Ligand binder design. Structure first.
Ligand code: FAD
Ligand code: FAD
Lengths: 272, 274
């Protein structure tokens, strides 16, 4: 009796992105999951943060500050109802799947805005509850991404550079920041040169994976306990941990590379 | 630098914001040195950040299987792009220097600016598969990010909780700007602006204005040149074997994205080297 939310960011029902979403819904239902959807284009979701996101009375309409105002509105219950409806789907969900095409080395604008409007302070993060101590630490998230370019272009030696660096801002900075356990991304390269028969196998592989998704070991991020979590220490790594890491050849993660070598496929493969 | 044109793109809804103050400072300083300055204030324009069919005003090649990249390109060549897009494209064509002023939001650009990239940077106009990176169409132009953050600089140091800022900037500076040919200059990073006392804020504006007086003479950031790579589908756009052999013995990689499994050159995306 577990709940999945699927967030889709593609305008076209004829797209492979849409096929992947449908495959995911079908596979999860068959294993007895409840499945909810946020198909952002079909919903005409508004991706722009603004004053209109607060329906009540602004604390300071002369010097409007979205982070402070949005948080008050969350606590006092005057957030725009489109936001609240999305927040409730998240609260209920155990597993969150994000299905989208890579666009300009990141998430589509409409999905970026969903994060901006929905992941409000106090709901999705606090100063005290970041990263592995975040509110969504009981939940799991996975990115399912399609690219036009081939895998070689995003290898260590490819023209675009390491895919692991491209995913880091999203998987660390958005998902893990709010507490999500992040699973290995589903990467579908060069979808535009892939014939129908192959596409069907890929969907079959996706469906097969989703049968056991909940058992998978997540990606590694540096635990928050390695850091001094307060304003005076500057949220720096503890001195003792610095001393223990001095002599190692590899860094901890893509973002915590510490000037050394980045552990291989830190953002693509779990250590297991 | 007289005779030269700057475009300033702003992504902030509030005229009372420090972001807006930074834009105004930039406009003032550039005009005083005789630049022509054009603005795209995306919130003031109510810019539509969502790609759709309505971006093509003519006839779709294939309405049954709609694919934005193919359709947008045809529309660019045949001249039936939505005119809001074209007006932005014309500002870009004319501009020598592009400044992007925005607050960091979820470790990147605001959605409204992300959409501007998606709607404006159309194939053939801003990139081709033959003209990528340093061979791209905008290779005569310079771009600079000016970013404000809520969190402090320590949080984005090598040992900070959020991790190296260099990694955060890479997808934007390499993947969007340099991909289209821009020479990318050192970013202007303004940390913890909300907890900065007034007198410091004033110095920051003054420093920004002083920098802009000689911005055109600055050395750009280092990205691996395209000439290190076999640019064709059979080679897989991999680095040439000979270049791999020359790099085998070095301790540092080439860039954040081209770290090659080794150490990342210090402040690759924050500081230029000469
Ligand atoms: C603004 C923008 C920026 C971009 N930036 C990048 C970038 O930075 N990097 C990059 O690599 N790419 C980039 N791209 C390319 C983009 O990532 C691809 O267009 C995307 O991955 C394509 O997937 P799709 O779902 O749109 O498939 P489509 O091309 O829309 O569909 C593929 C085919 O699969 C078929 N299909 C659908 N369902 C099934 C099924 N069940 N069985 C069999 N066949 C089926 C469809 O009918 C169609 O023929 C960008 C594109 C845009 C528009
Ligand atoms: C959705 C969202 C996501 C975010 N994600 C992140 C994140 O990932 N990382 C992060 O670090 N931060 C993040 N933030 C915080 C964000 O980066 C800051 O709120 C923003 O950078 C502050 O800039 P501002 O221009 O809005 O500040 P404001 O609060 O508008 O301005 C700061 C101060 O400058 C004063 N000021 C205005 N004009 C002048 C002037 N002319 N001279 C002097 N002082 C002046 C203002 O009155 C105020 O005191 C996020 C915020 C949002 C809304």
């Amino acid at each position: 009796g577990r709940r999945a939310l699927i967030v889709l960011a593609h305008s076209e029902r004829t797209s492979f992105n849409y096929a992947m979403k449908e495959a995911a819904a079908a596979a999860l239902k068959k294993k007895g999951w409840e499945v909810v959807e946020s198909d952002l284009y079909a919903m005409n979701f508004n991706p722009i943060i603004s004053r209109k996101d607060i329906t009540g009375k602004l604390k300071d309409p002369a010097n409007f500050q979205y982070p402070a105002e949005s948080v008050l509105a969350y606590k006092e219950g005057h957030l725009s109802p489109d936001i609240v409806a999305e927040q409730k789907k998240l609260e209920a969900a155990d597993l969150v799947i994000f299905q989208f095409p890579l666009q300009w080395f990141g998430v589509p604008a409409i999905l970026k805005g969903w994060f901006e409007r929905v992941f409000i302070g106090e709901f999705a993060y606090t100063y005290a509850a970041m990263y592995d101590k975040g509110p969504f630490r009981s939940k799991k998230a996975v990115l399912s991404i399609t690219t036009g370019g081939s895998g070689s272009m995003y290898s260590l030696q490819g023209i675009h550079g390491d895919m692991n660096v491209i995913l880091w801002p999203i998987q660390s900075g958005i998902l893990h920041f709010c507490g999500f356990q992040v699973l290995e991304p589903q990467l579908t390269y060069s979808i535009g040169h892939t014939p129908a028969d192959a596409r069907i196998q890929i969907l079959e592989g996706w469906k097969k994976r989703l049968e056991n998704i909940w058992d998978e070991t997540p990606l590694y991020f540096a635990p928050s306990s390695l850091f001094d979590l307060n304003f005076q220490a500057g949220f720096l790594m503890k001195k003792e941990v610095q001393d223990e890491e001095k002599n190692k050849k590899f860094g901890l993660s893509v973002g915590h590379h510490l000037g050394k070598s980045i552990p291989t496929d830190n953002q693509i493969k779990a250590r297991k």
